[PDB]
Amino acid sequence: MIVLALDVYEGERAIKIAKSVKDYISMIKVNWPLILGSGVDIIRRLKEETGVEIIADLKLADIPNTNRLIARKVFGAGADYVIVHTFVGRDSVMAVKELGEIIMVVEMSHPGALEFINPLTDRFIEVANEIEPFGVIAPGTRPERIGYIRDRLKEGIKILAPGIGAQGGKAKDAVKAGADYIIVGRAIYNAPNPREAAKAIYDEIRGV
Amino acid sequence: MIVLALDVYEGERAIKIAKSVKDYISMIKVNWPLILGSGVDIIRRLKEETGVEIIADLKLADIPNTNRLIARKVFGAGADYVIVHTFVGRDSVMAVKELGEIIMVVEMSHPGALEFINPLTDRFIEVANEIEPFGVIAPGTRPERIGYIRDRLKEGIKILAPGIGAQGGKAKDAVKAGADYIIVGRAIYNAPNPREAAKAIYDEIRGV
Ligand SMILES: O=c1ccn([C@@H]2O[C@H](COP(=O)(O)O)[C@@H](O)[C@H]2O)c(=O)[nH]1
Numbered sequence A, B: 001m002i003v004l005a006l007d008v009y010e011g012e013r014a015i016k017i018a019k020s021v022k023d024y025i026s027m028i029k030v031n032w033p034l035i036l037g038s039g040v041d042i043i044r045r046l047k048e049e050t051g052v053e054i055i056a057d058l059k060l061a062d063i064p065n066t067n068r069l070i071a072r073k074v075f076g077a078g079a080d081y082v083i084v085h086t087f088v089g090r091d092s093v094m095a096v097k098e099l100g101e102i103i104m105v106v107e108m109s110h111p112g113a114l115e116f117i118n119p120l121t122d123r124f125i126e127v128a129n130e131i132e133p134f135g136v137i138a139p140g141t142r143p144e145r146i147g148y149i150r151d152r153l154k155e156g157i158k159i160l161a162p163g164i165g166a167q168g169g170k171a172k173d174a175v176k177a178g179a180d181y182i183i184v185g186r187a188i189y190n191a192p193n194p195r196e197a198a199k200a201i202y203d204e205i206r207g208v
């Protein structure tokens, strides 16, 4: 269930960390920091070095034409999934979905998410239900909201929850609430021993 | 003042276009397509080749920590301004502003913008007024909305309007409505003669 969020700038550093924790993860999530620091080709290299699927957390939020230009390049680089915002509207979301599997942001994990996003959660779930993306982003920092979303989201849609570890969210609470994937970044990549850190979360989720 | 939206993947091609239309533009806007295609260093290259200010249209929309990590690399690469979304919250906006000048999205130009963004325009204007970014994004496709925003937006904040040309917006109307800058991409870079296309729009806005 663990999704490693590799938010370091250095590509070889990312590959080293990924290889050391590969045994305990399900997927790797890359964001702009690593792409900016190593080039988009880092996606293909991570997949070849680890054998796991790659999620490109781009938080796409532009007009349809630009979302298309971006997504085609990133899916072309090997991304298995692309995360897109829902607030920019249906047309921008579809421009990306036409190119590959997507994950729609429903509710974010940080404090600022309560200002405009959280108040529209119901509406976003409605859009996700009609579009039917591979999954949606729910707040690992607010497990009660993960349940809220799960209860209203079509069964076939998965829930991925970031905000575990550094942001304060507990892996066990998120899984119990209905998260299918547990996104973990700093708690693993900033740990003195990333493998030991990943194993601890892996054990927590197994309930041992 | 024309801002060139250089949304092509190829760096040498982008530099050629920029140099050919320099006489008629005031700034160059780089988005993810060019950054992905040529690397973030393309920003430094464009500035060295044209001597014009560069806007990094990243539409940042992540949590505070990640927004900082991204802005660090982009401002570090020479970006004079970074575009960030307001929807994600004030904390995410300030994480970027603490590192350099920003432009906040208030209302977008595509059809999808009417679903969630447009209904919250009043609130977004309020946030922009409190943060005081260099400028905000207003819809070149909806001139009447540009004037609406300008009247309620703090005097010192500039308005940049994309959606001119390809999307149907008219440059004269946007400027007349209160846009300080009009962003133009395809109408220029998709043109057989980029310089001629830029000059035509330049003459269109002369004498507002
Ligand atoms: O609502 C969201 C959406 C995305 N992310 C991303 O998930 C990862 C969380 O990393 P960390 O807080 O475990 O270090 C980062 O890439 C962050 O940008 C969040 O944290 N919260």
Ligand SMILES: O=c1ccn([C@@H]2O[C@H](COP(=O)(O)O)[C@@H](O)[C@H]2O)c(=O)[nH]1
Binding pocket: A062, A063, A066, B005, B007, B031, B057, B107, B108, B109, B110, B137, B162, B163, B164, B165, B166, B167, B183, B184, B185, B186, B187
């Ligand atoms: O509300 C917005 C915000 C940003 N952009 C950006 O402005 C440029 C418009 O290019 P074009 O329609 O002139 O080709 C592109 O980079 C697009 O991503 C918009 O078009 N509308």
